Structure formats: structure tokens, C-alpha cells
Amino acid sequence: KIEEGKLVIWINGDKGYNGLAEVGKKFEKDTGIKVTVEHPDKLEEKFPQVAATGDGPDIIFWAHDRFGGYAQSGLLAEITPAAAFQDKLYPFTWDAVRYNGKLIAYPIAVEALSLIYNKDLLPNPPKTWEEIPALDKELKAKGKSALMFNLQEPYFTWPLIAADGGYAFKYENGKYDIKDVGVDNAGAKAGLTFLVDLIKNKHMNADTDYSIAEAAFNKGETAMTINGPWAWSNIDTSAVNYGVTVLPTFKGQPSKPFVGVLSAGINAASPNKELAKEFLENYLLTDEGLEAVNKDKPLGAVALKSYEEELAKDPRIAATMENAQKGEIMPNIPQMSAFWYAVRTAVINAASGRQTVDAALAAAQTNAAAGSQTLVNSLEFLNIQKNSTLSEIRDIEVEVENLRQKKEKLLGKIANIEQNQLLLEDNLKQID
Amino acid sequence: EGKLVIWINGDKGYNGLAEVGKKFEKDTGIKVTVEHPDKLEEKFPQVAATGDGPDIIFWAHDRFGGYAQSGLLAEITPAAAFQDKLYPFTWDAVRYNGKLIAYPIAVEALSLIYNKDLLPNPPKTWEEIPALDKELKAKGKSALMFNLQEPYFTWPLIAADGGYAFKYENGKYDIKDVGVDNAGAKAGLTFLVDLIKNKHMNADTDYSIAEAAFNKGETAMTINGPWAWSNIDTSAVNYGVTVLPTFKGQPSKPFVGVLSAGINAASPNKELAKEFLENYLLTDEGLEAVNKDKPLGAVALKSYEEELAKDPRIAATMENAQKGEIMPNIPQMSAFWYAVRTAVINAASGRQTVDAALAAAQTNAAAGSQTLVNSLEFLNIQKNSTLSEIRDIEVEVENLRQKKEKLLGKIANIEQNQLLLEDNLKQI
Ligand SMILES: OC[C@H]1O[C@H](O[C@H]2[C@H](O)[C@@H](O)[C@@H](O)O[C@@H]2CO)[C@H](O)[C@@H](O)[C@@H]1O
Ligand SMILES: OC[C@H]1O[C@H](O[C@H]2[C@H](O)[C@@H](O)[C@@H](O)O[C@@H]2CO)[C@H](O)[C@@H](O)[C@@H]1O
């Protein structure tokens, strides 16, 4: 299971996992505990599968949006940093990781999507989505293309969907109404329609994913991309002159990225709970840990006031936080994965051309309205956790029965010894 | 839309299938479009729930009971004359709750495929394959590689010693008696994971990696269906198709699939699709056209199977099929397959023990009544989608009714005028 005496850490393959593993060498070269940093596929879906059986990593890194489901499923340990540690991180980053009054993870860095443009194929990035087609017609005349970004994950297409009024769960009076879902409304329809019209007019391709878009931009084949800070590393080494700027407006309104706070939770099945705490607070969440990670793949606007006051002078970080301000902080409520799955389907099926935008989003709206899928999903993981726990109990009872069998055989040995002692003590009394 | 669009999976002979689409277009002039989208079996119900998707969908029969329960498949209406051209047991695979829900095309089963120059005889047992891999490793080769990402391919071994999906007895399936947890399933999956731990296979091998290695002569054995024989033909590896090895002395038990063609319930071209399938595909000419692209296996059309049955590769196919089981077509199959995919991937990667992986899958698959909620979801989507078409029509009707009312105004006023002129005329 989760071997005790070591820390295993999961973080997504696009993050600075090699830089994080350097913070693991320091932990291992300093405290002797070994640290293994892995980047599995579909990490956010494997974690609850294995953690439900007491397996998985000690620490799981993901944006805070997924952690409310992990918590409701009972898979997360209680985070308990001291008030002294709390004043080192911006309070709004602690806000992202608070669910029903408990801190369910440590905030690390603030992520938001920005516009990234090739400084030499385009001297000024377009201020509006609406001008991007004309730019692409011109740019293709030179053998290049205007824009390429990942169309497979709704994270990347939502800023445009949300611009004119799309929303996940209505947020009002400080609370989300999970039956007021806004993926159906006219704003959402107009955004996805513009996107599918871009595809159908041959300005982008529905088959484009993350790898194809990064390859295309870093080779000077596309004028613009949409991505987070992690992507800056690979663009640096391509010797492309790139700028990071505000996302284009749509119908006169800013694109609204959903803002992620990359967070570290501690597996509820971890025996190394306090070892994990010390790693995060006194190794990761410091200038040298964060800088080691950050120089692998930039983290974005880190939550630690100490190192952030230094990264904030990067113009790319300001442009990140300006885009972040125009968007909305993602909810962390359990229904987010259900929301994300509904919107993922819609975008792929509308982009593929085999469903209309109107039909795709009407389906997604009703699906997302079924947010009581997360109750069934949490109950499922809890029923796996229970059966696994009963199984450990039965193993213990076999151990106890074996021991009990040895004991009974020893008591038998003693019974026979006592027979002898009675015999010899009578033999001795008669010599007397 | 006056044309036929068809979905079929990318490992099938879609190029050959399109040739039958031309021969359809040259006779009726109707265009035939053959696409092989990824995850078609999962996209289909998403889009058909809103009245979209393809006209015809090709997949193994196991998925069609869920499509039918969600109300997304048209009732097939073969004439008694046409029904007697197909083996009756292939009709049973596509029969769900008394209705025929698709046309059967071909019977599929996995076989062992081995390099006859790397191996004089296929192994009789799974248990000897490690020793064989060692001997081969010393020569720069490997014993066995097959797709480990899809539970379809690992099931023959999982079932060998007693694993099963849903218990079948008295003619019906008990969807609460699930056999992915039992000692037979565990022993099969444990053997698979030990192969990986001992470096005889790699948990990341998938379909593409395994085919390449075998067709390049890099590995002595693979496990695959008939669709794969074409590419091995063009590679000039000397290969045999044979019965799978035994495990713990018992036959491997592959799940048998009947490639089937369903007709979308929202298709306006239902009769064209019927005509395409009955009188173009399901004939000695059409099945041969597909079969020459990528072999189909044992086709359902008695006339063309009589010829195929002479191919020893088809005999070995049918011998493997007989040791296995025809897959259920019940709605719970998708939940079953997803649960077992999870277990195999998580245990093969080493993140979970076999016991824990399969205990979780057992409890998941035991909740197969997520297919009832899932169908109820698709139906309420279909209903809401339909109500919107209705509301669009009713706007057209009210507009037309307003245009009418305005014309009745013109007529009323003309009659006023006529009254004036006709009395003024009676005075004159
Ligand atoms: O639904 C898409 C996806 O959006 C976010 O995932 C992001 C992640 O937050 C980023 O750090 C980066 O890794 O890209 C991911 C998308 O590819 C949500 O955090 C995630 O839950 C959601 O599924
Ligand atoms: O995966 C290759 C193989 O997959 C199919 O078998 C499926 C089954 O039919 C599906 O419902 C799926 O979810 O489970 C098995 C894969 O794990 C096809 O039957 C076969 O033709 C195709 O090549």
C-alpha cells in the first residue's frame, strides 16, 4: 500500500515535476526520507480510484476545483497549518482551498489562461476574438496560422463561452446554487458558436489538442496560443519571441478564464501525514522550493507572499493576474467534475460538427443539472472504502487466530509440565 | 438527410465498406459517407439522444442493448426470406426484449497469432510463456505482446480459471451475480501482472505498439481478432492463427462479439439504410468487399460463410469462440467493461493489488443499475430536444396564422368596397 517512511507525490505531467523532485532530493539529502514524484495520466481520476482502497500517493497536486469531491468522498486528510504559516500565503489563495470551514489542501500558485503571441508574425495581438478570422486569412497567405490551442479540454474554451454570459453554477450571496446552471443561456450559445464557426471556417481544427498546439506555436507555425504559465518553459527554449497578454474580448466583453489554485492535498490513507506536512510547509512552500519548481515550469502567481512579491515583477505574471481578475475563481464544490464532464462532451460534439451548438449545450445543461450524480459517486467510493476496510479487518482476525493457536499449544505444553510436576512431587513426598 | 452516414470502428475494413457505398451510390445515386470517429460507441448515444449522429452504427452487439433501452435504435424489420440467409444464432445476438435491434454482420473472437519462424509450436499453456520469453530475450526478441489497455484482450485469461461477467442460467442473466471478484478472476489477473513485474510484458503496450512489434518480427506471439490479419499479410511474417494457451489447465475464454449494424432511431433515411444493409452489404459481394479490406471473421450470411469456413484462420477463430462465451447484450455491459478496464489498468501499473483492484470493480459492476439512471437521462434529453422542435414548429404556425388573418382582412375590406360599388350600381 502506501509504504510508510517515504513520501510519494503525484502532480500533472505539464507541471514542473522535475523541479519538484529536486525539492525531494533536498528532503532526502536532509531528512533521509525518500521522495518519489510521479506524473500519471488522468491523475485527477486515478487518485479517488486507488485512494478508495488505501492506495495512491501521500500528496496529490491538482487545481483546487477537484478537491471538494475528494473531500466529500472521504479521501483527504485534515490540513492543519499554524496561524504562523497562514500569514505567509495570500488569504484569497486559502479561500480557494476552504470547503465547509476546513482547509482541505495547501494552496501553491494561482493559474489563469493568457493570450500568448508570436512577437514576429504579429506585432500587436488582436484585442477582440472577432478580428481573429481576418488575421488568420492573412496569416495563412504566408504559410502560417493565426491561432491554435487545446480544443479537447473545456478549461481552454470556457473563457470564450463565459464571456457573453456563460456560467457554471450561479454565485450569489456568497453561495453557489447548483440548480441555477448557466451553460444553456444565450451567452454560452454565442461563445461556442463563434468557436465552432472558427473551426468550420478553417481557422482552427477540432482535432487540435495540447501537444499539437504547443508544437505548432513553438515552431513559428501559429501566431497565437492560449495557455497557462507552465507552457512558458518550452517556449523559452524554442527561441521564439513571445508575448503574454490579455485574452481577446468577445462581443465587447472580456474572456472569463476559470481561475485555478494549484493545491496539494494529503491522502486520507497516508501513514506519513506529518512527514507530508513538514515537506510542504518547510520545503515546498518556501522561496527555494517554489523557485526550484518555478524554474522547471513556472507556477504562476504563487501563494507565498515572500516569493510572490518577486515573481509579480514578471510582466507575464501581471498579464496572468490581469486575465485572472477578468475571470472567476473556480468553485471547489463536489459538482465540478460533473459540470466539467457535461461541458467537455458538448464542446467536442459541437466542434466535431455532428451536433448543433444549441443541442450540445441543451444536453450539457440538463446533465450539469443532474449534479446529484456526485452524491451517487461519493457513495460509490465510500462503499469501496468500507469493503476494503472490512477486508483488512478479516486479515487481522486471521493473524489473531494464528497467534491464538500458538498460545493454546503453549498452554498445552504447560498442562503436561504440570502433570509431571505433580508426579515428581508425590514421588518426592514418599522418599520423605 | 437524403444521404447515408455510417460509423464503424477504425480497426475494421471501412475502406472496403466504402466501396459498397460507391456501388450503392451508382445504383440509387444516394451518397454514402463512412466515418470512423474515435470512441464512436460512446459518442453515438450522446448525439442520438438529440436526434443526431449517423444513420447506421457498426459495433459489436454487446453495446446495442443499452442503445435500445435508451430508445436510440430503430426496430429492424427483416423479411422472413432475408432472415433465413443469416445463421439464427447471430440473430439472437441482436435480439433484445423480443425485437431485432440490428443486423448481424460477422462473428469475432480473439485468437493466438504466432510467428512460425520464431516458434515451431504455439505454447500449450500460459505458464510456459515466461521461460519462452527468457530464451527469446537472449536473442534480442520477446515472447508475447498484446493490447493491455482494453479489457477485451485480457478477459480471455481472466475468465480462464473462472472469471465471468454476469451469471447466466435458466436462460436469463442475474445482474447481481457478478464474477469479476472470484478466485478464478484473481488468479488470471495475477498471472498477467506477474508477467509485467517480471518484464515479460510492459503495462503500456497498446494495440499499435503490439501490432508493430509482431508484424516487424520482434515478438513471437500476439493476441488479436480477424481484422488484424490483413496487415500481417502485407508484412511477410510467417504466422499461424491458433487456439489460445490454457491457464491452470483450462481453456482461455474470449468474449465473442457479433459485429452488428444498427439504424439510428432519429434517421430519416431508415428505408435507404435498410436497403443498403440487406441488399448491398449482406451479400456475397458486399461482405467480400469488406472482408478483403480487413477480414470480418465468420460472417453471418450463410452463403458467404460457406466459403470463409474453408480458411483455417476462421476455424481457429471459431474454436476459440466455442471455448468462450457470446457477450451479453444487456444494458449493464458498458458498466461491466468500464469497471474491468479500471481494474486491469490500475493493477497492471502496480498502483493497486489485484485483490483490491478486482474487489472495487466487483462492487462497481454490481451497481449495474447506473444503466437505468443513464437511460432515463438520455430519454429526458430526447424528450426535451423534441419539445424544442415542437415549439419551433408552433412559432411557424402562429406566423402563418397571422398572415392568414391579415388576408382575411384584405378580403373583408374588398367586400366592403364591393358593397359600395354594387349598390351605387343598382341606383344607376
Ligand atoms: O475540464 C478541464 C479541466 O480544467 C482544469 O484542468 C486544468 C488544470 O487546472 C490546469 O492546471 C492544467 O493542467 O490544465 C488542465 C486542463 O487540461 C480543472 O482543474 C480540471 O478539474 C478540469 O477537468
Ligand atoms: O477494443 C478492441 C475491440 O473492442 C471491442 O470489444 C469491446 C466491446 O465490444 C466494447 O463494448 C468494449 O467496451 O469492450 C471491449 C473492449 O474492451 C470490439 O468488439 C472489437 O471489434 C474491437 O476490435
Author numbering:
A (entry chain B): 1 to 432
B (entry chain A): 4 to 431
Lines from the paper:
They can form different oligomeric complexes, and the helix orientation can either be parallel or antiparallel.
The antiparallel CC proteins (MDV1, Mfn1, LMNA, BECN1, TRIM25, and TRIM5; see the legend in Table 1 for the full names of these proteins) usually formed aggregates or tetramers in solution.
